[model samples]
Target: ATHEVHMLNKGESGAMVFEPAFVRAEPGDVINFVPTDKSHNVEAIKEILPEGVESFKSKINESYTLTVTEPGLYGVKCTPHFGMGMVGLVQVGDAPENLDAAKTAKMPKKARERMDAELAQVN
Candidate 1:
């Protein structure tokens, strides 16, 4: 499935955003990100990329796709806007399964907060 993120806040100005910030999917599904603008990108958070998956990265507007090969919660973020809270979550298979373990995962303050909040909604 295709998901969209905002380089600039779609609702208000001077802010970066990722709409529908949290998504749920299954393995074998291809997850792609499309930029509404430039100066943005996506990467998988190392601490929470599931047990068998490696962290991945892609440039915005570059048309990249990721195949979920593991079953767990994935922490994704816009490289440029991560600090500004332009982050997202991808749940593959029966997530929030080992996700509670992810709640205590390691990441920066804002990034950790954004992810923790999203998983909170799931668990």
Candidate 2:
């Protein structure tokens, strides 16, 4: 599947952050980064714990193509606002089978209950 993420200018000229905290994708998924306003880049911040992944700290924009070559949990943060919780996570493959449950478990009880009640509307 093809995934498209937009880089937005979050109160700055060229700033962006992944709105969703996590994204789940299977192997061979293409992550397309498109800038919505100013220039931005997608660089890997951590690689040690993610197994076979490398760190991306460089700037990228509308011309970069990132291919998921391995299966693991990858964490990425925006260079400009990384300290402000401008980060995202990607889970590849099925190894981290508990990721979904873990994520849902992390949600507030009220939100989790609401989501559970609305599960049928989830697509």
Candidate 3:
């Protein structure tokens, strides 16, 4: 399946956020990060990736696509706005083996809170 996540400046729930901040996806699902606002860019959090999977980063104002092929927690952020809480989570497949590692990765106060909420949804 294909999932669309939009980058927004101000949203219903927060500022500098990824609308639908948490995604429960399956392996092989395609995720498209759209530039609803021109200033934001999507980048994978290096500290929270599945082993052996390549990380990704999109240029500012550009859209990026990623195919989830591993069962783990993938952390995402907007480089310039991450401190203001522009963060997201992608949970792929049933068992995310790196939950512990991903959860403990350091983040700014706001980003940590959002990520924690997303982590709570994991099965």
Candidate 4:
């Protein structure tokens, strides 16, 4: 399966944000991160990922794509505003084997909070 997530403006009065804060996917699925508005990037949080799952960091306004190969909750952050709650969650596989670990992994205060909320929606 293929999916798409847009990086919306939710910065300093900019409103940059992700269109869908949470997503559910499976192995072989491809997720494309579409860019909108202005300067921004997408990055997969490495600290809380499924076993063997790799991390990703996109260039400014660069369209990013991710191919799911593991089963877990993928926590992503907007580098420039991770502290402002610019976070996203992608739950892979129906069971998300490592979902519990990701939920407990420590991260920026607000990002953790946002991920908590988004992860709930992923189920």
Per-model TM-score versus the true fold: 0.79, 0.62, 0.96, 0.88
Q: Which candidate gets the maximum lDDT versus the true structure?
A: 3
Model 1 regions more than 4 Å off: 1-8, 11-14, 95-97
Residue 104 local lDDT, model 2: 52
Over 62-88, each residue of candidate 2 has an lDDT whose tens digit, in order, gives: 444567768765555556555444555
RMSD for all candidates, in order, please: 2.7, 7.3, 0.9, 2.7
Rank the models by TM-score, top first.
3, 4, 1, 2
By TM-score, the best candidate is 3
Residue-level lDDT tens digits of model 4 in 32-72: 88887567788988876888877789998899888988877
Q: Which candidate would rank higher by TM-score, 1 or 3?
A: 3
lDDT of each: 0.70, 0.53, 0.92, 0.78
| Model 2 ranges with Cα > 4 A deviation | 10-16, 47-49, 60-63, 97-123
| TM-score, model 4 to reference | 0.88
Model 3: lDDT equals: 0.92
What is the Å distance of residue 20 in model 2 from its true position?
Answer: 4.2
TM-score of 1: 0.79
